[PDB]
Design a protein around this nucleic acid. Structure first.
Ligand SMILES: [Zn+2]
Length: 462
RNA sequence: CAGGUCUCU
RNA sequence: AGAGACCU
């Protein structure tokens, strides 16, 4: 992606959009019990912790664009992925505004706890003022779809969250692009059934993990991904995407049967307009992280990317022997012979993609099941039942989370969730974690799950 | 102060 | 109907 221009709002006639400037995060009662290196992200240009210009660092992620149109590898790549999707039988027909607004068995309803975006969020109009769970009213939606139209600008905000000390020094917080309610509704009408099918089918047919439950899914992955593993990381994935990948996505949607009216909506996320504070800017390429379909479209494009890199990097690649699952930019894949990712990374460079060794490794090493990660979790065979696989969130990560809160009223639920993650690391690690919690007065007031109870419930899942 | 998935009372 | 965990 690449910023095409920046203009003052006066010049463009867009309302200003300001976000909160102080973090909601505060040190928790456990802050000094556990070690950790993360602090709330820089939210303000005048943050004492900064070491660079804030706004400069914020938009450095739009590194630029290489290809605008598909070459032959990408075309073949897209067609291979699109054919594989055909067996899913995605319903290319348009979903109903009520279903799109209020949800289905495989698609959650539009979030009403959350901003309506441009221009409502500056006219003091909340989504609860337009929709109603209990009515399933679509009557006010239709009205505002007509008053304000589609292709409304995204509203740029900085993300309030823990970040490592380095990224706080270097001002590399993340940006969130608030969609307009109008475009969410309409994208959900055009692609709702695709979303539904994807959510229902995590695995190697969709090539996607959206909708997986790591407790159970992790036992399936070494069967779905047989042979030699490969993996790697992306830097600035969403923003590094050139328009060719949106052209490639259009190819897939077409091949599985979407109308041209449906396929036309892709250009409206490849080319977007954003308001940050008092300015308007234009972005070409780059996924707008905050549009409907963000996780799924990023995942689909990733499926195209991997295929294209393989056949352009190596000779004799049979794409039918590829197995992969993606969650946005996160990927785990296998092939019947080892794949050198150093060479894939070099081809990736020509495509404007920056690919690094899996898991912040210094160099591209071998990936096996003992050191692979996915959604940050390792893979650890159960000592009693080795075919049952524990997802393992690292204790270091869990320590970072517990050292802060945004609202100490819900401390019980926070610590419980971490316990659900911790116990997979084993009895010894879990009792060490629990007893550190107990070492402090509110720690003795919490209801903490029993290890063998967690385990027994896990086994019952099968 | 966005789009989502997962889990819990 | 609440809450938390995790991906962008
Ligand atoms: Zn533009």
């Amino acid at each position: 992606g690449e910023i095409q221009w920046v203009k003052p709002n006066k010049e463009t006639g867009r309302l200003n959009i300001n976000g909160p400037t102080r973090t909601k995060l505060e040190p928790s009662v456990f802050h000094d019990v556990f070690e950790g290196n993360k602090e709330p992200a820089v939210l303000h240009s005048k943050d004492p912790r900064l070491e660079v210009d804030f706004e400069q660092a914020l938009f450095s992620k739009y590194v630029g664009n290489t290809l605008y149109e598909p070459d032959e590898y990408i075309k073949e790549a897209a067609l291979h992925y699109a054919n594989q999707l055909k067996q899913l039988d995605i319903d290319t027909s348009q979903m109903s505004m009520e279903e799109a607004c209020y949800g289905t068995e495989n698609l959650e309803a539009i979030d009403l706890h959350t901003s309506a975006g441009y221009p409502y969020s500056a006219l003091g109009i909340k989504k609860r003022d337009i929709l109603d769970s209990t009515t399933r009213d679509v009557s006010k939606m239709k009205f505002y779809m007509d008053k304000y139209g589609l292709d409304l600008p995204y509203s740029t905000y900085v993300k309030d969250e823990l970040r490592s000390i380095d990224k706080i020094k270097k001002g590399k917080s993340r940006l969130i692009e608030a969609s307009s309610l109008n475009d969410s509704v309409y994208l959900r009408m055009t692609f709702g059934h695709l979303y539904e099918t994807f959510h229902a089918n995590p695995g190697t047919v969709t090539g996607s993990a959206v909708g997986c439950n790591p407790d159970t899914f992790w036992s399936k992955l070494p069967i779905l991904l047989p042979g030699s593993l490969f993996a790697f990381d992306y830097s600035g994935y969403d923003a590094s995407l050139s328009p060719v990948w949106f052209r490639a996505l259009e190819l897939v949607l077409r091949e599985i049967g979407y109308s041209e009216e449906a396929v036309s909506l892709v250009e409206g996320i490849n080319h977007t307009h954003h308001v940050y504070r008092n300015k308007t800017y234009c972005v070409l390429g780059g996924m707008p992280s905050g549009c409907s379909g963000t996780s799924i479209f990023n995942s689909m494009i990733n499926n195209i990317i991997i295929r294209a890199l393989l056949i352009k990097t190596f000779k004799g690649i049979d794409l039918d022997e590829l197995n992969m699952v993606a969650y946005g930019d996160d990927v785990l894949a296998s092939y019947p012979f080892p794949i050198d990712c150093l060479e894939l990374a070099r081809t990736g460079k020509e495509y404007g993609l920056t690919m690094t060794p899996a898991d912040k490794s210094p160099c591209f090493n071998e990936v096996n099941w003992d050191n692979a990660t996915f959604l940050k979790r390792g893979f650890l065979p159960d000592e009693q039942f080795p075919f049952l696989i524990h997802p393992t969130m690292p204790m270091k990560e869990i320590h970072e989370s517990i050292r802060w809160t945004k609202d100490a009223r819900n401390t019980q639920d926070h610590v419980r969730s971490l316990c659900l993650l911790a116990w997979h690391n084993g009895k010894q690690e879990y009792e060490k974690f629990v007893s550190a919690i107990r070492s402090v007065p509110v720690g003795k007031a919490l209801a903490i799950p029993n290890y063998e109870n967690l385990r027994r419930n896990w086994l019952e899942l099968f």
